[PDB]
Ligand binder design. Structure first.
Ligand SMILES: [Zn+2]
Ligand SMILES: [Zn+2]
Ligand SMILES: [Zn+2]
Lengths: 115, 46, 260, 67, 124
């Protein structure tokens, strides 16, 4: 009667942007990234990778409503740095980490099956 | 057009037209069931 | 400001589960990997049923739901098939779906067990796991003499976010800091609690001394497979899927940055 | 009415274990040892097999609608 | 199919509607990846004093781990909480039915060890 289709958690609606960047006016060098059709899976890793950047002053995320299917990630960096650049570097670092983890898991599987 | 029904007691496929008392021709039982439609109903296995 | 250099150590690899350890990674990465095991590792499962005849004691949706939860071998085919969203065909085609047929009739006096062995596929690679060449076959329905079940299913590509039938795991044990050194738990009576299988403590010692400078490292995993994928295929597909989620996110990020 | 396919909690397949479970029980296994023989180690799957009531066997005592 | 707003009840007067449904990766999990089918609020216990709910949960954990059916007949001196706890401690569990759970969203351990186990629920 009121059950949303299960794909609405993963699929973007037509004309809906995957990610939107909005300047935070309260403090300088801060941005809000509203990412649609993602959840804690990417939010937590992006936040925790951003916390590894010493040029990042704030890194947090929230799912504003569990029934809704977006996350907001707030990133504040030092003045010489940018929150968009920080977010990009965090994603790049996560991708490199996962590539290395995948190659090493392939090697470990090969060793385990062989000996 | 035929509207074949099944008997509740003898399970016999028998045709009955409108304005006809509901009686199985094989055993006279008074309760009949319609057969499953031929239309194509789809289920999401969820 | 840069990526981790995680290492891996697989401590057990069977056809049923994989038990491994990831070290030198963040807890968020470990838990996102754990979540992707459950919710973003695609597999093949029946997601469309057409009942041509069902005289069984279970109604049509019961049979359909029951067929959807039968695991189908998805190892090499799931990467090749497309989502029906992405397929440029009609409702179905062999590029985005797999056809199954089931046609059973109980004529004999003993009860006929309509099992997953009766799910006949057009694709030899995508078959019910129990039907793969021990464990018995999954029971779809029991039929009495004169009862009959004839249906036509189509299996699709999906993951556990959409429905648990596309979840490839039969349990994902995840653990870290087996000895409570980070004190992320606070036992009122630490002596009362059993020791983890990964604990390295003498029996007199209940929990490790508190580590003020500690961070969660060395996450232990036991990924049990429902049958569709091999456990190591579940882990590899999870890592690839998480990496493609991040890559797509970065692509859209670049479009948003350059459009500003 | 019939043995579920998956364990509600973890999603382990239990549909193929009901008949084997009954065969082990008539083989003079205890329910715990039978559940151990089938590889149900989490108490959720043990719940699934141990608390199941096979009502379909009673529904098959009624003649079908068509012969 | 059960949904938000459907009424469920245990056998102890503990009724309530489904507030929300989380997927298995969003629910909290034990070290062996068991997620709860249902999560009920601890504040429903103290004023109500439905200790039978807790004893049934603990007895049910013992029953599921032992392969038997628990005897909850009302006035039975051969079955008390200490015996059930001693039985549960033999299966590698905290004797009082608590377990370390992990946050499904972040994977961090929950500081307070949660009371979890099989309980017979009813859909109304
Ligand atoms: Zn008749
Ligand atoms: Zn197609
Ligand atoms: Zn289970």
């Amino acid at each position: 009667m009121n059950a949303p289709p299960a794909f609405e958690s993963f699929l973007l609606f037509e004309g809906e942007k995957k990610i939107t960047i909005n300047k935070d006016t309260k403090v300088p060098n801060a941005c809000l990234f509203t990412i649609n059709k993602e959840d804690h899976t990417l939010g937590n890793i992006i936040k925790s990778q951003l916390l590894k950047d010493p040029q990042v002053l704030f890194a947090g995320y929230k799912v504003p409503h569990p029934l809704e299917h977006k996350i907001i990630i707030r990133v504040q960096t030092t003045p010489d740095y940018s929150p968009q650049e920080a977010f990009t570097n965090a994603i790049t670092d996560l991708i490199s980490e996962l590539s290395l983890l995948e190659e090493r898991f392939r090697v470990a599987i090969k060793d385990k099956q062989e000996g | 057009q035929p509207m074949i029904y099944i008997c509740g007691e003898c399970h016999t496929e028998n045709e009955i037209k409108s304005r006809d008392p509901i009686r199985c021709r094989e055993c006279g039982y008074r309760i009949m069931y319609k057969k499953r439609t031929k239309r194509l109903v789809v289920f999401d296995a969820r | 400001p840069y990526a981790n250099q995680p290492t891996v150590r697989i401590t057990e690899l069977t056809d049923e589960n994989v038990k491994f350890i990831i070290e030198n990674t963040d807890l968020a990465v470990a838990n996102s990997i754990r979540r992707v095991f459950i919710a973003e590792v695609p597999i093949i499962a029946i997601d469309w049923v057409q009942i041509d005849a069902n005289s069984s004691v279970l109604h049509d949706e019961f049979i359909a739901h029951r067929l959807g939860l039968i695991p189908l071998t998805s190892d090499d085919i799931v990467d090749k098939l497309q989502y029906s969203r992405d397929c440029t065909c009609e409702e179905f085609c062999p590029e985005c779906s797999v056809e199954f047929t089931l046609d059973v009739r109980c004529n004999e006096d003993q009860t006929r067990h309509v099992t997953s062995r009766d799910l006949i596929s057009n694709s030899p690679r995508v078959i019910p796991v129990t039907s793969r060449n021990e464990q018995d076959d999954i029971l779809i329905v029991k039929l009495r003499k004169g009862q009959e079940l004839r249906l036509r299913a189509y299996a699709k590509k999906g993951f556990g976010k959409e429905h648990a039938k596309w979840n490839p795991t039969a349990g994902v044990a995840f653990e870290y800091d087996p000895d409570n050194a980070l004190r992320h738990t606070v036992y009122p009576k630490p002596e009362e609690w059993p020791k983890s299988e990964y604990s390295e403590l003498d029996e007199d010692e209940s929990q490790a001394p508190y580590d003020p400078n500690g961070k969660p490292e060395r996450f232990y995993y036991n990924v049990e497979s429902c049958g569709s994928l091999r456990p190591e295929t579940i882990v590899l597909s999870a890592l690839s899927g998480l990496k493609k989620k991040l890559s797509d996110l970065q692509t859209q990020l670049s479009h948003e940055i350059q459009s500003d | 009415m019939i043995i579920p396919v998956r364990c509600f909690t973890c999603g382990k397949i239990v549909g193929n274990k009901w008949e084997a479970y009954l065969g082990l029980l008539q083989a003079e296994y205890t329910e715990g040892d039978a559940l151990d023989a089938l590889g149900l180690k989490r108490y959720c799957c043990r719940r699934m097999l141990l608390a199941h009531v096979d009502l379909i066997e009673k529904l098959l005592n009624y003649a079908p609608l068509e012969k | 199919i059960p949904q938000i707003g459907d009424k469920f009840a245990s056998r102890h007067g503990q009724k309530g509607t489904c507030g929300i449904q989380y997927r298995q990766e969003d629910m909290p999990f034990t070290c062996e990846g068991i997620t709860p089918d249902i999560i009920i609020n601890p504040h429903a216990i103290p004023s109500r004093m439905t200790i039978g709910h807790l004893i049934e949960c603990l007895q049910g954990k013992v029953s599921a781990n032992k392969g038997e059916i628990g005897d909850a007949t009302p006035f039975n001196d051969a079955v008390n909480v200490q015996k059930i706890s001693n039985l549960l401690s033999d299966y590698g569990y905290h004797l009082r039915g608590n377990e370390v759970l992990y946050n499904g969203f972040t994977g961090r351990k929950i500081t307070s060890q949660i009371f979890i186990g099989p309980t017979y629920y009813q859909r109304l």
